[PDB]
Amino acid sequence: VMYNWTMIIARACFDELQSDYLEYWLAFDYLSDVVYLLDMFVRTRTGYLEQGLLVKE
Amino acid sequence: KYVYSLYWSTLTLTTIGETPPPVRDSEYFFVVADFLIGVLIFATIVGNIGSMISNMNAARAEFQARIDAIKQYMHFRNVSKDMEKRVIKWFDYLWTNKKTVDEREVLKYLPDKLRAEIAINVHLDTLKKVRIFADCEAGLLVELVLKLQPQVYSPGDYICKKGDIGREMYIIKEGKLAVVADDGITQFVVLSDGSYFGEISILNIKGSKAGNRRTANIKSIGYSDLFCLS
Amino acid sequence: VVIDPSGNTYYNWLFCITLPVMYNWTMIIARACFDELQSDYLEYWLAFDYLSDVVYLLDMFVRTRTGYLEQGLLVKEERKLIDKYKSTFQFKLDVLSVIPTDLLYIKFGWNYPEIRLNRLLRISRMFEFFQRTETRTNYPNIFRISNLVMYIIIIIHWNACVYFSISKAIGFGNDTWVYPDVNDPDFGRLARKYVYSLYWSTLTLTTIGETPPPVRDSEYFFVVADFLIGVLIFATIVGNIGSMISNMNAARAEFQARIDAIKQYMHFRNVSKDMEKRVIKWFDYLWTNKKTVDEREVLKYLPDKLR
Amino acid sequence: KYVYSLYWSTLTLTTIGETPPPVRDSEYFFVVADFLIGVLIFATIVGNIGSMISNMNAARAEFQARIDAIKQYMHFRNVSKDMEKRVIKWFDYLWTNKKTVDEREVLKYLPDKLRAEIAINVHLDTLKKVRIFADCEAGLLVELVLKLQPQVYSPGDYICKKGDIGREMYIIKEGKLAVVADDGITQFVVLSDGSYFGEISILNIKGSKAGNRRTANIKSIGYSDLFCLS
Amino acid sequence: QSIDPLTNLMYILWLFFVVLAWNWNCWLIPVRWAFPYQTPDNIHLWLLMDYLCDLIYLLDITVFQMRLQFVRGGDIITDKKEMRNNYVKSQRFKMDMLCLLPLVNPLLRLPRCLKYMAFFEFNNRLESILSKAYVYRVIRTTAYLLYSLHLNSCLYYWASAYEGLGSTHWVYDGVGNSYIRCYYWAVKTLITIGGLPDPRTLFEIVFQGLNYFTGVFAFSVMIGQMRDVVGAATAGQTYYRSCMDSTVKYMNFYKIPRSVQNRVKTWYEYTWHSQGMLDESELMVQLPDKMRLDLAIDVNYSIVSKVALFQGCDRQMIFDMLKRLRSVVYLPNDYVCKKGEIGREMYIIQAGQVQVLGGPDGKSVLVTLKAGSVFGEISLLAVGGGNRRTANVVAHGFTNLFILDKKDLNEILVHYPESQKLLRKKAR
């Protein structure tokens, strides 16, 4: 999220940064989406306290 | 291309006269919005360290308030200078070795189970060593542990003198008491930590010899920090 | 032989060790970043450095003979004191600050005083002084404002030294943002240099832009960094001043709030105006004669024996 | 010669930097000191104004803290929505009419003599209108006035119901009570300020028919600040 | 149909429209006076909004504003009769009846916009309803500063028009949108009105300090409002944190073992969440006594009222017990009741579940009780050390019990003999 916040407007405005470091941007960009999917997985694997029982279903 | 723009953004947020005039109309909007936005964040951050700084030095503020109130009280009451230096030294000791907060308001929120657990952790062996409380139930010993009260003394302070009314039992936690004569000299015995006195007088006994009356003057060599059961 | 860490000898020794620590923190960067101070006054800061080193050693010895209270009784055994000293991060810091680094003078030349940059670690001792003094002073607000002002002075001096070092690295006269030149009749005098550096650093840490604009990328970044540092500094200053004023006015504010509570109650319930005057006069009598605090609550703070 | 100097002073100490730059090695640190003094000055105004605005806006802060705490408590314990509305209305009524702080806490700061005089001033004529205390010693009436306790209520609140222990007397200072049947819909007697109904019950008369038992349901139709003698 | 000035949910939303209209007037009158934006292509559309503003101002004089319940001597007046004449004699009608009389031009509507109290009332309603109301004060002062700059720019445009476009150094032109030009000028002069080599005259240099002081005052108000808002927001967090590390420092001083340290830290964290307060008595003591009684009889009254032990007693008894109920949170796998213990208290369940660990050799669940279940009431009528517990009771998770000690029952019983005889008869 930090990368997607301070390293997206720096390429949408500085057209030379992207044109130079496109390969690194692509690698980190795909990694970001992979971690975003894993975010859905983890959020689906978090419990919540029901009467203090910590549901594990 | 990056650093010049960063410096320009800094100038635009901070000042308004350090950059060439926005000769185009659409640039005036940018500069005005930058000034208002930057003044907003600057007020926010200034308030933030203001609140943090106020929070950092607050225990010192209340401690100084207590000291000032004490000194004013014993200024308008003509209390002698010896007592003045004694209480000043007491507050100095409190601030230097951090002890300003009391044990009773530290644990005032915990439920009785956790208070009982921490209390039997702090002092249960010493209470089990007490002669009267030796072979008694665990529930009673838990009931007697939550009722202890801290009392911290100063060097030379007299815990009790001969002939005083005794209605307390004292257990030395971290200190060194001494049994002195009525003249204050000629040390008789030295009571290190973990020991106790006045255990027979804490409970009424049919036909006791020295009924509710201390029979020995005992004082503190250094600081005492002992617990009392009424 | 052992000195009470709460007595008076300890406090004056805190002053005596605070002197050379501040001397180092102020002069090392200055005479490393200018090289005209270092060249001219060689023997002054040979003697001063020797004095600072011997005072550091004496501080080590004093900390070995300081003492602590065990079972409420202050310890008076040399072995226990030495072992207690050789257990804290302070001992490591002191040893780091006391290693002989002057042997690099033959290796790096007499133009490098930065080698004595390890002495900038006893500052905690200095801090300790500014704590103890705050307890022993008569009016804490004046002392604390003086301490804050001194901190600002130290920071501004460091910024001026850094600016002059950067200017020397880039080159005197290479652009309009750098220091003008070392060949002018006035700008090469080591007084104009230092005072102009102070002026530039003060004008840059405070509201930014008044100084000549930068030319190179490094200068552009340095200006922004100095602006950020100055913003943080000014926020700290205003926070401290606000805390001071609130602490000074808290007692009067609470007494006034009590008065308004009483007055609001007496306006709610229709009370004879004569009794309103009587209670107002009573509160004024309490304030003027410094009897505005309640005896019972005051005595509650004390322990039972002292009470 | 003075206007120009004053203008230079007020532009240098506001740290505008519109003055000609120093050029002679003595104006430099003079301007440095002027900038330092200006920074300290501006810090002084901002701190003083912040402290003033904090002190002037302190009662609202405590009231908001209490209101948020009670709202959070009543949301946490799943109290009824009707009671939520009732409590919110009671709190807003107390803030609107400046009755937020209870009278005992308000008057705690006054000395005993002044507090007694104010208590006699506010409610001692009313305590002389009750039937039982008509022919009574004034010295006892002073203590009885000193023993009155405030009680604030809300619309629909019941004071005594019926068949209760009945160990108090109520003096209606402000508001209007009402006497209702077992089902609180029919009204018989609507009391007003200065009235009282628990006079006989407190003085337990030997042989009294239906002693210490309220014989009528009394409910508050307004907010009815009352005073109770036990 | 008398309406409630507070919590009506429609009066506040209509006050929103009225304050919006008042803001429209207060912000558009200076612009219409200074800038020639009242072109024939926009005069009709501006005057339509003028008609709607007049209509909504009329709605704020009569009709809806006519109805408003108030309080007199504690009694709420909501009969739609008596405050018909109370409003006309009130200050609200006084600041009206001159803010609506017929009289574009600067002085045309300056006396016709004076309702500064309607906006304050809307403020009060907003802080009464909105939870995050602290930031509203700062956005209010932000609007104040922006309005100050707006007026300072409108005055500059008027001065430029009266002096001529292209006459002196400080004037501007009208090639573009002059509003933002004048706003930029006002903002620039708010901090930059000096200069030694530019002695304009004896009427501009003199007030430069005045405008700088106004800016500094507004800026200090900004900083103070930020600091107050931050303190109000972080007060609870700071208090909870301070209590937590004070307890931690105490326990580290006394060398408390790691396990009980973890348990007490867990209690602190779990109670900070879902409560917001470390204890509930400190809040209740500040409360009015009747409010506390109503809270007790609305939280856990029906649970104790159906207890078979206290059947047939009066209501003051059970009310006082409810007032003396003490809340407590138990950690998972915590022995609420131990076998062979005095078991003097009487617990009720309000959130969670508990289990009676029985079986052949223990560690076997026999029955689990849920919210609304009481247990141990038979001990409340016992004597000193005569109710040794029968079995073990363990909390399944984070349970919320309401303890009522036997000593409190004895103290309450001291004042009730007719219930004491019944309780002793049940015990016998």
Q: How far is D17 from chain E (nearest CA, A)?
A: 9
Asked if B227 contacts B175 with a C-beta cutoff of 8 angstroms, the reply is no
DSSP D207: T
User: Cβ neighbours of residue E296 under 8 Å, at least 6 residues apart?
Assistant: E319, E322, E323, E325
| Alpha-carbon gap: A14 to the closest alpha carbon of chain B (Å) | 8
Nearest to C202 among D32, D42, D50 (CB): D32
Measure the CA–CA gap between D114 and E16, rounded to whole angstroms. 48
Nearest-angstrom CA–CA distance, C232 and C220: 19
Tell me how far apart the alpha carbons of residues E386 and C199 are, in angstroms, rounded to a whole number.
86
Q: Which residue has the tokens 């930057």?
A: B38
C-beta of residue D107 within 8 angstroms of C-beta of residue D122? no
Q: Mark yes or no for CB contact C301/B69 under 8 Å.
A: yes
Measured CA to CA in angstroms, residue B137 lies from B132, C149, E118, E232, E362 at distances of: 12, 64, 71, 50, 22
Within 8 A by CB and 6+ apart from C146, the residues are none
Whats the size of chain D, residue-wise? 230
Method: cryo-EM
**Would you give the end-to-end CA distance of chain B in angstroms?**
78
Provide CB contacts within 8 A for C163, sequence distance 6+.
C179, C197, C200, C201, C204, C222
DSSP state of B177: E
CA distance E223 to B57: 20
In angstroms, the CA E330 to CA B100 distance is 31
Q: Are E404 and E377 in contact (CB under 8 A)?
A: no
Residues linked to residue D177 through DSSP beta bridges, in sequence order: D220
Nearest neighbour of B50 by CB, restricted to C5, C223, C242:
C242
Using CA atoms of C270, C273, C277, C283 in order, give the dihedral in degrees to the nearest 10.
0
Q: How far apart are CA D217 and CA E226, in angstroms?
A: 52
CA distance D206 to chain C (A): 38
**What Å resolution does this PDB entry report?**
2.8
Question: Mind telling me how many Å the CA of D41 is from chain C's nearest CA?
Answer: 10
SS3 D221: coil
Subunits in contact with chain D (3 or more CB pairs closer than 8 Å):
C, E
Q: Which residues contact C220 (CB under 8 A, 6 or more apart)?
A: B3, B4, B6, B7, C214
Contact between residue D200 and residue D208 where contact means Cβ atoms under 8 Å apart: yes
Burial class (CB in 10 A: 0-12, 13-18, 19+), D72: middle
Residues 6 or more apart whose Cβ sits within 8 Å of residue C282: D110, D111, D114
Query: What 3-state DSSP class applies to D87?
Result: helix
Question: CA–CA distance from E163 to each of B182, E156, E179 (Å)?
Answer: 100, 10, 17
Cα(C226)–Cα(C219) distance, integer angstroms: 10
Q: Where are the alpha helices (DSSP H) in B97-200?
A: 103-106, 112-122, 125-129, 138-145
CB C199 within 8 A of CB D28: yes
Contact yes or no for C261 and D43 at CB 8 A: no
User: Residue D101 carries which side chain, given as an amino acid letter?
Assistant: V
DSSP state of C206: S
Is the Cα torsion angle B77, B79, B81, B86 positive or negative in sign? negative
Q: Which residues sit opposite E72 in a β-bridge?
A: E75
CA E310 – CA E294 distance, rounded (Å): 20
Please enumerate in sequence order all residues whose Cβ is within 8 A of that of E300, keeping only pairs 6 or more positions apart, or say none: E322, E325, E348, E350, E402
How far apart CA C286 and CA D60 sit, in angstroms, is: 27
Q: What is the dihedral of CA E122, E127, E132, E136, to 10 degrees?
A: 50
Q: Which two tokens stand for residue D204?
A: 């337990």
Q: Which helix (H) or strand (E) holds D228?
A: strand D226-229
| Chain E nearest-CA residue for B112 | E328
The annotation places the binding site of E for 3',5'-cyclic AMP at: 389
Q: Do D8 and E71 touch (CB under 8 A)?
A: no
At CB < 8 Å, which residues of chain C contact D? 149, 152, 186, 191-192, 195-196, 198-199, 202-203, 206-207, 210, 234, 237-238, 241-246, 249, 253, 257-258, 261-262, 264-266, 268-272, 275, 278-279, 282, 294
Residues 6+ apart with CB under 8 A from D166: D160, D198, D201, D212, D213, D214
Structure tokens at B115: 């208070």
| Crossing angle between the packed helical segments E11-34 and E116-129, to the nearest 10 degrees | 140
Instruction: Give the Cα separation of D159 and D201 in Å (integer).
Output: 15
Q: Which of D165, D163, D133, D162 is nearest to D147 (CA)?
A: D133
User: What is the signed CA dihedral for E285, E289, E291, E297, rounded to 10 degrees?
Assistant: 100
User: Closest Cα partner for B4 from C214, A18, A16, C201?
Assistant: C214
Q: Subunits that touch chain E (at least 3 Cβ pairs < 8 angstroms)?
A: A, B, D
How far apart CA E212 and CA E218 sit, in angstroms, is: 10
CB atoms within 10 A of CB C156: 22
User: Measured between alpha carbons, how far is C261 from C269 in angstroms, rounded to an integer?
Assistant: 12
Residue D198 contacts residue D170 (beta carbons within 8 Å): yes
